[PDB]
Amino acid sequence: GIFKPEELRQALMPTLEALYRQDPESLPFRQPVDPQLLGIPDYFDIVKSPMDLSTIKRKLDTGQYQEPWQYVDDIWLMFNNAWLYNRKTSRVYKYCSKLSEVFEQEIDPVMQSLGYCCGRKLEFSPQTLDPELFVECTECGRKMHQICVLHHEIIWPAGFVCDGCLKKSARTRKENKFSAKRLPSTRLGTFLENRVNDFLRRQNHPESGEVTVRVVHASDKTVEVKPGMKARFVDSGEMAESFPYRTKALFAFEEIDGVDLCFFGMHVQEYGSDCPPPNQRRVYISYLDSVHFFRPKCLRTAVYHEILIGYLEYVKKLGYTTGHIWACPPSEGDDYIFHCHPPDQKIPKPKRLQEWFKKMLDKAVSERIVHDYKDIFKQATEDSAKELPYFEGDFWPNVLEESILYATMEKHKEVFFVIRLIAGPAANSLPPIVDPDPLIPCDLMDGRDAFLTLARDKHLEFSSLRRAQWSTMCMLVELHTQ
């Protein structure tokens, strides 16, 4: 026992009385359902654990609840039975939804007054609902959402100690060494975060946190020319068989309410100077993703721009001549790089996404980082299908197979950006591209599949700030302990 029964009763009874006072919405919930009198003889075939307000009151009054989650559980048992048994359009269903809304408001400040994280009954997103897990304070015995208190067994193996118990004993929580800042740095990561933090300091907005950019994957790969064009151009001995590239994964994190938040992810393909044409000295953005919790809101878009402009600046200086972006929005539900985006984070329509890349590239011109950029139509004109750069997982390889030319580039022109970084003479007499960062092997971050799979297995959602904080903590433990 943590509480005197009278203490628990005096704290919770007012939240019960809040529900009882709601009339008519409490009328179906005041007494045990009597299926005979109500003419619903199938009630007990569907509802196996009936619960009502008079029962909960008698449990409070007789000291039956040992800790308040038991009370919250009986409340949500009572709501769930009504939502299970009654139609969505029914009066009782709608009354039950009203009481759940009044309960949500009342329980929170009460559960926080008794030293709990919150009073919420929490389930994961559909991907039947998996319940959120609880951890137990080793000092006081209170149970709390694992996600509310960000308790990870690998970071803190001796167990969870709540803020209230730590303050009581004049201790602070042992530092999280599995942080984004303590991930191994790269010249690329440093260059990007230095550009982002220089920009944020110049803005001098009080809400902004430090930003971290970490390259977390770097491996050498090859894209093989698919059979239906190997037959035409490769087998003859005209086009090269396979194009070697470096695949890199990077993430940007922000300090929000004292902890790491992963808010941006990018995969790139880097076809260097020892790469046969038409891929020679090109970079390709495989995929971009974000989680909209960057603070402040008013700088979110600029920060994304600073990372992307930063990346183009950096590869230019190494000797890449051209950047390529397939400006195509995702369509994998609430997933892409990040599992389970916030439900109010809208995927942009093709037009808005094109206007967003356009805006980013106009700033890059103003800075003399991008010399010029155009749609693949106007750059194919200004330059056979053998001469198009051939990138792993891109639209263009797949569409030339559907055929086996100029027809297709016109109808889908605005979705393909070609970005001249080094144009004209300067491009001709360049040193070899040498990447000064080591290879970073990491199977979890090798393409976007493996991390989506882990996030599905382990309910690493990005659907709210609190869940995105827990998922950021969990991904960083994985990245440090590989």
Residue 203 region by backbone torsions, left for phi larger than 0, else alpha for psi between -120 and 50, else beta: alpha
Q: How far apart are CA 355 and CA 260, in angstroms?
A: 30
Kindly state whether residue 329 participates in binding ligand C3I, applying the rule CB under 6 A. yes
Q: How far apart are CA 2 and CA 112, in angstroms?
A: 15
Kindly state whether residue 145 participates in binding Zn ion, applying the rule CB under 5 A. yes
- Closer to ligand C3I by CB, 11 or 347: give it: 347
**Which part of the chain contacts Zn ion (CB under 5 A), choosing from 76-84, 117-125, 177-185, 199-207?**
117-125
Q: How far apart are CA 165 and CA 172, in angstroms?
A: 10
Q: How far apart are CA 283 and CA 269, in angstroms?
A: 6
Q: Least distance to Zn ion from the beta carbon of 105, Å?
A: 15
Counting runs of H as helices and runs of E as strands, what totals does the chain give? Answer: 16, 9
Q: How far apart are CA 459 and CA 394, in angstroms?
A: 29
CA-nearest of 132, 117, 107, 121 to 164 is 117
Kindly state whether residue 118 participates in binding Zn ion, applying the rule CB under 5 A. yes
Q: Is 290 annotated as a binding residue?
A: yes
Q: Is 334 annotated as a binding residue?
A: no
Q: What x-and-dash track marks residues 28-67 binding Zn ion by CB under 5 A?
A: ----------------------------------------
Q: Least distance to ligand C3I from the beta carbon of 347, Å?
A: 5
Q: Is 300 annotated as a binding residue?
A: yes
Helix, strand and coil content of the chain, in percent to the nearest 5, comes to 45, 15, 40
Q: Is 301 annotated as a binding residue?
A: yes
Q: Least distance to ligand C3I from the beta carbon of 291, Å?
A: 8
Q: Least distance to ligand C3I from the beta carbon of 233, Å?
A: 33
Q: What x-and-dash track marks residues 333-372 binding ligand C3I by CB under 6 A?
A: -x-x----x---x-xx----x--x----------------
Which position among 25, 132, 260, 289 is part of the footprint of ligand C3I (CB under 6 A)?
289
Q: How far apart are CA 55 and CA 137, in angstroms?
A: 29
Q: Least distance to ligand C3I from the beta carbon of 97, Å?
A: 24
- Closer to Zn ion by CB, 118 or 239: give it: 118
- Closer to Zn ion by CB, 69 or 93: give it: 69
User: Which two three-digit tokens encode residue 46?
Assistant: 């569907």
Answer positive or negative: Cα dihedral of 456, 345, 330, 357.
negative
User: Which two three-digit tokens encode residue 350?
Assistant: 């093709």
Question: 3-state class of 417 per DSSP?
Answer: strand
Query: Which regions of 187-296 does DSSP assign to beta strands (E)?
Result: 211-224, 242-256, 259-271, 282-290
Confirm if 319 and 426 have CB atoms less than 8 A apart.
no
Cα R_g (the chain), whole angstroms: 29
- For 359, the enclosing helix (H) or strand (E) is helix 350-366
Q: How far apart are CA 249 and CA 437, in angstroms?
A: 13
- Closer to ligand C3I by CB, 71 or 357: give it: 357
Kindly state whether residue 133 participates in binding Zn ion, applying the rule CB under 5 A. no
Answer positive or negative: Cα dihedral of 418, 423, 428, 430.
negative
- Closer to ligand C3I by CB, 289 or 394: give it: 289
- Closer to ligand C3I by CB, 9 or 339: give it: 339
Q: Is 288 annotated as a binding residue?
A: yes
Q: How far apart are CA 144 and CA 157, in angstroms?
A: 17
- Closer to ligand C3I by CB, 66 or 345: give it: 345
Kindly state whether residue 162 participates in binding Zn ion, applying the rule CB under 5 A. yes
Kindly state whether residue 328 participates in binding ligand C3I, applying the rule CB under 6 A. no
Kindly state whether residue 69 participates in binding ligand C3I, applying the rule CB under 6 A. no
Q: Which residues of 113-127 are buried (b: 16+ CB within 10 A; e: fewer)?
A: ebebbbbbbbebbee
Q: Least distance to ligand C3I from the beta carbon of 464, Å?
A: 13
Q: How far apart are CA 124 and CA 17, in angstroms?
A: 29
Q: Least distance to Zn ion from the beta carbon of 115, Å?
A: 7
Number of chain positions touching ligand C3I (CB under 6 A) = 14
Instruction: Name residue 253's beta-bridge partners.
Output: 212, 262
Q: What x-and-dash track marks residues 241-280 binding ligand C3I by CB under 6 A?
A: ----------------------------------------
Kindly state whether residue 137 participates in binding Zn ion, applying the rule CB under 5 A. yes
Instruction: Name residue 270's beta-bridge partners.
Output: 246, 283
Instruction: Report the interhelical angle of 350-366 vs 300-318 (nearest 10°).
Output: 60
Answer with the entry of ligand C3I, Zn ion, none that 334 interacts with (C-beta below 5 to 8 A by kind): ligand C3I
Number of chain positions touching Zn ion (CB under 5 A) = 9
User: Which two three-digit tokens encode residue 465?
Assistant: 């700030």
**Which part of the chain contacts Zn ion (CB under 5 A), choosing from 49-57, 138-146, 183-191, 404-412?**
138-146
Binding residues: 288-290, 300-301, 347, 352, 356
Positions at the binding site for acetyl-CoA: 288-290, 300-301, 347, 352, 356
Applying CB under 5 A, which residues contact Zn ion? 117-118, 137, 139-140, 145, 148, 162, 165
- The residue ranges that bind ligand C3I (CB under 6 A) are 288-290, 304, 329-330, 334, 336, 341, 345, 347-348, 353, 356
